[PDB]
Design a binder for this molecule. Structure first.
Ligand SMILES: NC(=O)c1ccc[n+]([C@@H]2O[C@H](COP(=O)([O-])OP(=O)(O)OC[C@H]3O[C@@H](n4cnc5c(N)ncnc54)[C@H](O)[C@@H]3O)[C@@H](O)[C@H]2O)c1
Ligand SMILES: NC(=O)c1ccc[n+]([C@@H]2O[C@H](COP(=O)([O-])OP(=O)(O)OC[C@H]3O[C@@H](n4cnc5c(N)ncnc54)[C@H](O)[C@@H]3O)[C@@H](O)[C@H]2O)c1
Ligand SMILES: NC(=O)c1ccc[n+]([C@@H]2O[C@H](COP(=O)([O-])OP(=O)(O)OC[C@H]3O[C@@H](n4cnc5c(N)ncnc54)[C@H](O)[C@@H]3O)[C@@H](O)[C@H]2O)c1
Ligand SMILES: NC(=O)c1ccc[n+]([C@@H]2O[C@H](COP(=O)([O-])OP(=O)(O)OC[C@H]3O[C@@H](n4cnc5c(N)ncnc54)[C@H](O)[C@@H]3O)[C@@H](O)[C@H]2O)c1
Lengths: 300, 300, 307, 306
């Protein structure tokens, strides 16, 4: 029988909830929205509120809220947005291990997309607790950074964001390794369209993208763009699209590094990470990536 | 020259934010997201988060947060979510002045717009906006029945295990005990629900629709519903921006219809290019006629 | 190992090519467009043309054209649009004789390479042709389904939308039985915004609307001069394919095998169904008037000649 | 009153009908299919067939068929897909002559009933057909545009995606000038997820992809036996229509009137443009290698000699 895909969203906060509503509107499958027992009810009300939109927007998806991982059984994809500095890492690292053990009990065959910061190490933890091969455990970072990058380049030139491309290796902030030489408008290199000063500010504003939103909102981090980035990565897997997207992936040789997670260009498909793509980098880029890999080792 | 539609959403909270993002997703137009000067930053931060999701989801729309009503200039549509956050006469009276204040800058900066009001009690608020605006009846509308039908349809769909797409609901009047549902004009794929769902189980679905708001409030712990209410507003914006001539329930101004006059009541409407194109009058029975009188009398 | 749904469309004529392009645009799966060997090159031309549209419309679907049924192996759904139209002056029996044969030859190769698929049949007359597919396939009944009422209700909703000047989204039609004289409309289960149409449209013009619905297929044939309708038919097939692939449990009129329903046994009839992941989940049994039971008994007399 | 956008599609054939159906499905506006008086019943038949799909696919649109240009009044956009039925003994030069005459007759009737429209031309040869539409219309240059480059880039992107086994969403092509031998691809400005294709695909296979792109229209003609491509050309048209009606400011290749751009004056040429609510907002001018200037110079010597 034809069965709907099943997506469990672990963490029913701003990000997990926006992600669930997006997945449901796109009819990508049934969504189980999961939080802690003391937020069980709020999670049931967000779910039921999303579901009550379905007649009007006109989508067929079941959306339920729960604190019982038995309800995530035989999930196809699990999105870990479950969050609460070296103490924070150790708290989130404790969560990741509690969550992952429940997840792979009930869904031994699922694919895991991790949003939890620092996503470099939060994913490594999932990967090691899960016991799953590296293709099945992925983290989000590069898509959000390229999303902010394209938005700034788009207002600068007064053109559709659809015709802007960014390229990002590494993590957020100072871990971020932009390749503005692989960044284009209409396929024209940006370095030919934006004077040096205005362009390096757009690169800086991308580095300070996540904080610019944390500053404006006052309480909590971004959720709209981050939810979009997870959905693009979910869609790439469920629909076996073989998208080329930057993701947090486990290296076993690529770019010289081994045994770590890092933001690299991948092919996202029905087998999860089909390939980590190896580019020829400049010495300036390899050096900026070596510094980034030093802050990934910094969170052991 | 072809110009985008401009939509301004007054109230950048839970409901207006969700409304703005849905409108942008569907490329219905440009969105200005409007709150009060002390919240101008977290508003600009929601608007920018949303706009940053545009590259990832593939929509061309601009979204700006403001506290300056000059930015809402030449709006095609204004949507009022401006809500207060205390007696039952306190919220009404406070919301009434908000409505007045908001409508005043709106009809100065966008003289020719259409207005859709969500702020509860919508029958009272929509009246205020209508009075302060000096616009004809067709150009000022509240949201209520779409959200009630959406709840009804969700519960019927679960009861029958069928798609929400093939469930109809029919409601006059407003929320709570002011709701006048006609189950006899409600169907699963054109089949009346009286013939498909027993008397007892159909009575409880209707009671659950009366208490639908409250059920989310209770589960949410703090604050009311937004996903389904945002969805309900976008359906009404779409019917107007695209001149669809939908038959939708809407809070409209009566002048002979159902025997009442000089009130805003939940009625079936043709919603099109001229907002309310016609108020539809059915042949009501006495137990429904009386139920509407008790609904008219409860809106005072 | 998340893999695309695979949909095979049999017949690369206007209805099958239109269907293929809609399925690919909606990313419902990978599409295999099949036709006879002599039309192999045209079939690949159409498929490659549709596929070259994918970067522009921004869908990820494979489309291929073939005359090799091995290319349809392990289809989740197979849509049959192969067969001839009833030419003016052609007898109904000649239409059935020719299409009966194509349905046996097509089903043979379909089930040879996709023993587990769902089958949706467009070929006319659809109760007779869906029955032939069922009996040839050896499939259980929930897996072999014909299109009829969706297309009849689509034309009905279009005419009524025009008469009342409202969106088609807010019109409901309701039809049992087949096309033409075989259609059994329930105007009393037909509404505008849930208001009965008998209360809104006077008797003469509503009767005209019902009669135009019966004649709708012939109206497009008369206007085209060269063949039959394809856009609305293709749309109707895609709505049924979606209901199944995405397990939607839609309530849709379908041509379904009855085993007691409506008091008929061992026939395909046009009835309200719930459509989902297991195909026909349920035939919905209605209480009909005696006029309705009679019109349905005349409609039945045309799959009885195929039993 | 909020009013629907209105689109007239001149020629209700394979490309015209395919385009009309995509425009209605997407809800970009009401659609008027126009053809010759003898083909008015076929045109109403397609229009009515499409409209009867609306309740099933869930779109609200008016679609009609006509032989009468009054039904096209106050169109926001006219798409020209009109061209003469290729008879057996039709001279290449006879065909271009007939079509040149169709463009003038069509354009005179269009600008009388829609003096404010934006016009997109598909009819081959599109550089010469679009110039003929421009000069008959009396409109300024930003409001008469040709389709060519989008279709070539669609075919290129399809073949690169096949070659690398990746999504077509993540492949980009760059093409100046016309179809076939007149095409000037810039593979150096062509990528897979931002990566130059020259680093991904060996030169012999990438040369062959380019050659398949030049030949891509004829590849479909050969397989079909009668007639030419219609699904990708319709899609290509609709992307350009959508970039105008929704003021998107897309960067797309279009057959655009040049007054100095690339050092040419008073010609239509395939060039990267910005496409928005005022039609062609900007012709984009690239720094070309002497080889690319020379390939383009040779491409312009085609546009003048037809
Ligand atoms: N990858 C990125 O670029 C990116 C961007 C934005 C957000 N983030 C990160 O995503 C995380 C969540 O963001 P948010 O705004 O949605 O946060 P939030 O605090 O609003 O929501 C987090 C949720 O996690 C839940 N949770 C905690 N422990 C749990 C457990 N054991 N089981 C189940 N649920 C549990 C909480 O109940 C809470 O509702 C944060 O770590 C944030 O920094 C990363
Ligand atoms: N029709 C329905 O059934 C329905 C459903 C849910 C919400 N609502 C109503 O809609 C309103 C908004 O609800 P919410 O959940 O978005 O609440 P919210 O408090 O999150 O949003 C209200 C926002 O309005 C802003 N605001 C107040 N006065 C303003 C003014 N004069 N100008 C501009 N902004 C102003 C506030 O600062 C706040 O951000 C409330 O009245 C709520 O009860 C109606
Ligand atoms: N329910 C309705 O009202 C409705 C609507 C329109 C068409 N139809 C049915 O659909 C059929 C096709 O419609 P169309 O407009 O595409 O006609 P068409 O003539 O364009 O298409 C029929 C195709 O079937 C192919 N075919 C024949 N035998 C075959 C075989 N053994 N294997 C594979 N392909 C084979 C033909 O080569 C042709 O390409 C009609 O004959 C009719 O029975 C039903
Ligand atoms: N890249 C491109 O720009 C591109 C690609 C493919 C098609 N084309 C061209 O598009 C044109 C249409 O191709 P098609 O396959 O749709 O052809 P078609 O023969 O199917 O349709 C052309 C239609 O134009 C109609 N027509 C003829 N004269 C007319 C007039 N005076 N007024 C109105 N309508 C008139 C015809 O009756 C016919 O129905 C051809 O010139 C073709 O070469 C160009």
């Amino acid at each position: 029988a034809m069965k709907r895909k099943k997506i469990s969203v672990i963490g029913a906060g701003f990000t997990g909830a926006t992600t669930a509503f997006l997945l449901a509107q796109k009819e990508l499958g049934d969504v189980v929205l999961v939080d802690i027992p003391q937020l069980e009810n709020p999670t049931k009300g967000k779910a039921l509120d999303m579901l009550e939109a379905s007649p009007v927007l006109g989508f067929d998806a079941n959306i339920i809220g729960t604190s019982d991982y038995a309800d995530t059984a035989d999930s196809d994809i699990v999105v870990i947005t479950a969050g609460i500095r070296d103490d924070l890492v150790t708290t989130n690292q404790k969560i990741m291990k509690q969550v992952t053990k429940e997840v792979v009990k009930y869904s031994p065959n699922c694919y895991i997309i991790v949003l939890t910061n620092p996503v470099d190490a939060m994913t490594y933890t999932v990967f090691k607790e899960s016991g799953f091969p590296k293709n099945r455990v992925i983290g989000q970072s590069g898509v959000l950074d390229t999303a902010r990058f394209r938005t700034f380049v788009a207002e600068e030139l007064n053109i559709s964001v659809k015709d802007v491309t960014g390229f990002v290796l590494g993590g957020h902030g100072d871990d971020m390794v932009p390749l503005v030489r692989y960044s284009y408008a209409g396929g024209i290199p940006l370095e030919k369209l934006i004077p040096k000063d205005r362009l390096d500010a757009i690169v800086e504003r991308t580095r300070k993208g996540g904080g610019e939103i944390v500053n404006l909102l006052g309480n909590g981090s971004a959720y709209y763009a981050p939810a979009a980035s997870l959905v693009e990565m979910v869609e790439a897997i469920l629909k076996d699209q073989r998208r080329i997207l930057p993701a947090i992936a486990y290296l076993e040789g690529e770019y010289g590094y081994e045994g770590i997670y890092l933001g690299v260009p991948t092919i996202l498909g029905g087998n999860g990470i089909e390939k980590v793509i190896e580019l020829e980098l400049t010495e300036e880029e390899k050096a900026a990536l070596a510094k980034s890999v030093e802050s990934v080792k910094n969170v052991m």
